[PDB]
């Protein structure tokens, strides 16, 4: 279950975040952290495709190499602050599962400026129980955490040393897929 209500960040700038470009997870926290693995790949791409908002997402697991894209329309809920419903897809978009009621993620951009950003969401997906996820993003892949971010997870009211970093994973992305995800 989640317990938090995460704070969108004062003066968030919507266009900059979802300008279509990718952003690369980095660094994670799981308040419930048995709930994901300790080695994983993650990232997504951002946008405003034909109107609409949109986010793209890319799951990989480097161990078991379980792998999966998802298609996500957004809601908002005030600035920064979203919910959103997926399809999971092939690369292409072609659909696997179909948007379903009871299958939704709440989306807060809690920090962000050009290249780094901090996000929380609360995943819900059928009758399994999940918990409160915290994300370091990059626009590149192997940035290490500056202070500002360092600084923003800090101000949550969160421990940066307990974050578990993606960065010894050899993770390879398909920025191309993302980019046209959106789309979809
Ligand atoms: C960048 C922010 C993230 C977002 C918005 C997000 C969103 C999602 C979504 C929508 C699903 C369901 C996909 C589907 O069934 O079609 C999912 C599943 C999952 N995510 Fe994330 N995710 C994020 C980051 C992460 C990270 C960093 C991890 C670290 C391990 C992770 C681990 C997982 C796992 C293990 C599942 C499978 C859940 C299950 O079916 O039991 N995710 N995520
Ligand atoms: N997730
Ligand atoms: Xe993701």
Redesign the pocket.
Known sequence: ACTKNAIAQTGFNKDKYFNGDV?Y?TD?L?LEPD???K??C???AAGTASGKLK?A?Y?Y?PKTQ?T?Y?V?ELQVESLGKYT?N???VDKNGNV??AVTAG???T?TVMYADDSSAL?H?C?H?GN?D?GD?Y?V?NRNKDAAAGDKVKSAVSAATLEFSKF?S?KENNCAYDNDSLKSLLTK
Do not use: C, G, M, Q
């Open positions: 952003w997870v994670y799981d709930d994901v693995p080695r994983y993650a990232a997504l986010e997402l799951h697991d379980d999966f998802d996500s959103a997926f399809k999971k696997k599962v299958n939704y993620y989306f996000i969401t995943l997906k399994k999940l996820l994300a993003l578990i993606t």
